[model samples]
Target: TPFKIAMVGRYSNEKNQSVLIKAVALSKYKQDIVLLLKGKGPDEKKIKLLAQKLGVKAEFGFVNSNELLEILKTCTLYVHAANVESEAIACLEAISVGIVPVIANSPLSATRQFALDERSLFEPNNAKDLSAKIDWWLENKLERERMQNEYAKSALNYT
Candidate 1:
């Protein structure tokens, strides 16, 4: 639970989905990436195959809303790879957790509004760029802790 990342949403959109896959590949802890998919899509096969090809473990499921929240709690970060903009509530939920997001740099999603300048935003559809973002995070733990602090502080209010 402590060792994984939960990627939410559908995988049909390669532009957004690839970022998540590429982000995992770029991860310093690549094997720890776990995906929690929301809807059905064709990318599932590719994702599974990609995982096997890349030597990373990946899982997907349609969880209840409450269960999804519990899963997100175990995650180190929440990643969204969607070409279309998300509803306000989705963005709010992910951001409220204070997990550092490495999202595709796009006008569709409001990722830039919450994530720190350098810590978030990979060039859209570029695996190299996404991978670089992952390397940047893996190389900088202190900064990661600081970035996560925003989430921790916010969580304190509810706890």
Candidate 2:
């Protein structure tokens, strides 16, 4: 019902789903944001507990390819908080839909390749940095849209 942000990935330790929940809790616009977490994993219970404790609005589920795109159409931003990844197809899918993405950066992460600038990358596992990055993207709509449109063009290479 507000500024929606989506993150689709496994709820494993490496994925850092808890960081997203903590980041939301620290965000200035926390009350106006809804976390759309789409994926299935063993750590789902832990993630859900963290979100609840932080008072962040989180929706957890799994979706197929078409369903993923349809849900992204309703989001203002997409976040990748994983500390490690092989091929981050999830971020690619988010980009393909023109949703501005805030990705995590780490020595083990392969997803940094998709980051266009510092604005798109945040310190790995750092909730404060992630929260700040999310806030910046939400506050700067013009820059966000400009980048979003660019992603729509660049994402064609993936398809």
Candidate 3:
């Protein structure tokens, strides 16, 4: 696989896991992308069904802390898709490890504050915008790598 995208959070409507599935489906790199969604919630079944229905390749379930860290380390991109959130530790954890982040730019979600630049922010609840951002990142590989280092450095500020 060319990209291993990870999203860690409760599997619920609020988290907007379906948006990710749709974003990946719309992305030009769909064939090269594989989504790994970690966590469980009441919406897990619905999320799984949506993935199946869209023919999107995704892995869903919970993992232990160490296991989650390992997955994060290997992930190419970390997407925080929540429509509503106060603060998300998962985004910080991924940033700490140098993985580039694409955050949902929802007014109701504080996670957007973590985005370093426009490329790191996507219109909230818009799958097309998310896919466009993903496409931008995929095309700008050097900038993506540069931002990864920048993101890791910024993580120290939160410490």
Best by TM-score: 3
The model with the greatest lDDT is 3
- Order the candidates by TM-score, highest first: 3, 2, 1
Q: Give the TM-score (vs. native) of candidate 3.
A: 0.96
User: Candidate 3 — what's its lDDT?
Assistant: 0.89
Task: Residues 1-159, candidate 1: write the lDDT tens digits.
Answer: 234555666557643565666666766667655655454567777776776676666666666556767776766656555556654344446556666666666676665555556567766777777767766765776887788777556544534
CA RMSD, predictions in order: 3.6, 1.2, 1.0
Tens-place lDDT digits, model 3, residues 82-112: 9887347888899988889999999888889
- Lowest summed lDDT across 10 adjacent residues in model 2 is found at 82-91
Model 2 clash tally? 0
Candidate 3 wrongly placed segments (more than 4 Å): none
Report the lDDT tens digits of candidate 2 across residue range 65-147: 77988889899999998887645777899998898888898878878778778998999889999999999998999999999
- Per-prediction backbone clash count: 1, 0, 0
Q: Candidate 1, 58: how far from true, in Å? A: 1.0
Question: If scored against the real structure, what TM-score would every candidate get?
Answer: 0.76, 0.95, 0.96
